[PDB]
From a paper:
Human transthyretin (TTR), a homotetrameric 127-residue protein, is the main carrier of thyroxine (T4) in celebrospinal fluid (CSF) and the second main carrier in blood. TTR also interacts with other proteins, such as retinol-binding protein (RBP) and thus contributes to retinol transport. Interestingly, TTR also interacts with amyloid-β (Aβ) and plays a protective role in Alzheimer’s disease (AD) by sequestering Aβ and reducing proteopathic stress. We also present the crystal structures of Fe2+, Mn2+ and of Cu2+ bound to TTR crystallized in the presence and absence of Aβ(1–28).
In order to investigate the importance of Mn in the TTR-Aβ interactions, TTR crystals were soaked in 5 mM of MnCl2 at pH 6.0. More globally, Mn may influence an A-A′ and B-B′ asymmetry. The separation between the central Leu-110 residues (B-B′ Leu-110–Leu110 separation of only 6.73 Å) suggests a rotation of the TTR dimers in a direction opposite to that observed for Fe and Re-TTR structures. The conformation of the TTR-Mn complex with a distance Asp38–Asp38 of 19.2 Å is within the range for distances observed for wt-TTR with ligands (e.g. 5EZP37) and even a wide selection of mutant TTR structures including those subjected to heating (PDB code: 2QEL38) or to a pH as low as 4.6 (PDB code: 2G4G39). No significant conformational changes were observed, suggesting that even if Mn binds Aβ31, it does not play a relevant role in the interactions between TTR and Aβ.
Author numbering:
A (entry chain A), B (entry chain B), C (entry chain B), D (entry chain A): 10 to 125
Write the structure that this text describes.
């Protein structure tokens, strides 16, 4: 995959399972267009969002639906979702892993960017 | 005083100084309306964004312009900006501090919510 | 005032209150000697650990007793404690703030190093 | 592996390669005994530290040599190393992944604990 998402739960020390993820790409008129979506697996990973053909240069937004995740666990969290906004493939195709570490009042996000 | 922002720089171990911060409030047509903005002080803090009267329950977005901060330091970053989206809720008298810790390819954000 | 500790609780979005903190200094036989200790205040802070006179260059260890904090909240944690080991260096007048953000299975720590 | 270490570099957005890792186990006389050591691979991962037979109940310390890592990159960091101290296998054998995210003045650590 050129774009992969990995989500961990810092309260349980486990992958964050069944987290909804929505990806958007900024259009020429400066609006967010839907690009791809999915849910994390039992390993907290989401693959197969896109192909290298479709994943062109652009500004992307990866929205990780954290409030929904915590609420299904009976926790009322602070954030609505985590939003990761970045320019992709500006110097040629790259492989991107977006990692997120979730707590109820806190999250972290890291990008690991590799040249295929 | 009901909403404060604090930004730290994980590379230099220092407050992140002169970072632009824009706050938005979600309108009833589900678009983001400008609400308040400022730049971080020498201590990495931004106070006086809003007042208790103006800061009603709703969904707010705090956007921290991290890319321009790193570009000014000669460092190539990943994110366009950091985005913290949350619901403000009345329960008792409460202060919101949004803290953000920045790295070029990573950031974390935490909400400290306390009483008067 | 040359060394301060600040601890936040990522689960509740609050200062971590009444966390024991022990500071050690590495002796010439490479063992840890007790240096200072305290408990975090209502604001999650611990001041007055040392003085400028006493805080000479050397290797210091700050140990934050996180397990007992989580056990007191009924939450099962991973770490025995958080450990921050660093060298204090003279260059100009400098203040060290060790900040720590706690989750049951995760923590982060940052050093904010500033001038007078 | 029952014990795995993964290290990421938050300045480069890449695995942290060639990071030395030393593992210790607390002995009955309350001293740290060497238990295993190794270096992260090109993927930032360290496997094969131990076997399920040798990885008994105990208090372990995983010391990640962060100062050495940054210095070889020409960066003078704050911390001497990251220290992760935890009780392992207290309720029966588990599989442990210790993840660390490194910046010069900051690091994060998370444990992912799975039941084989
Ligand atoms: Mn380009
Ligand atoms: Mn309400
Ligand atoms: Mn010196
Ligand atoms: Mn046991």
């Amino acid at each position: 995959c050129p774009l992969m998402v990995k989500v961990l739960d810092a309260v349980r020390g486990s992958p964050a399972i069944n987290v909804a993820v929505h990806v958007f790409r900024k259009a020429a008129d400066d609006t967010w267009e839907p690009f791809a979506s999915g849910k994390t697996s039992e390993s907290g990973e989401l693959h197969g969002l896109t192909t290298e053909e479709e994943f062109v240069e652009g500004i992307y937004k990866v929205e990780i639906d954290t409030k929904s995740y915590w609420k299904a666990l009976g926790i009322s969290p602070f954030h609505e979702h985590a939003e990761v906004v970045f320019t992709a493939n500006d110097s040629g195709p790259r492989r991107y892993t977006i990692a997120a570490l979730l707590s109820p009042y806190s999250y972290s996000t890291t990008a690991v960017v590799t040249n295929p």
